[PDB]
Amino acid sequence: GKLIQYIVEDGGHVFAGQCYAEIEVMKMVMTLTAVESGCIHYVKRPGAALDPGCVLAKMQLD
Prior knowledge:
This protein is mostly beta strands and 62 residues long.
């Protein structure tokens, strides 16, 4: 689906269970739950149809 907005910012450390983006799928909002903590580099400029597995972000495994 589309990338509405990014609820974090570029170069931002995150936590377990923390939303980092929000997208529109099936007409509905979606918690982009982060899965690993680290300094996200903002890869995906806003408003793009996305994929399961797309690189919205890369961090490092802290």
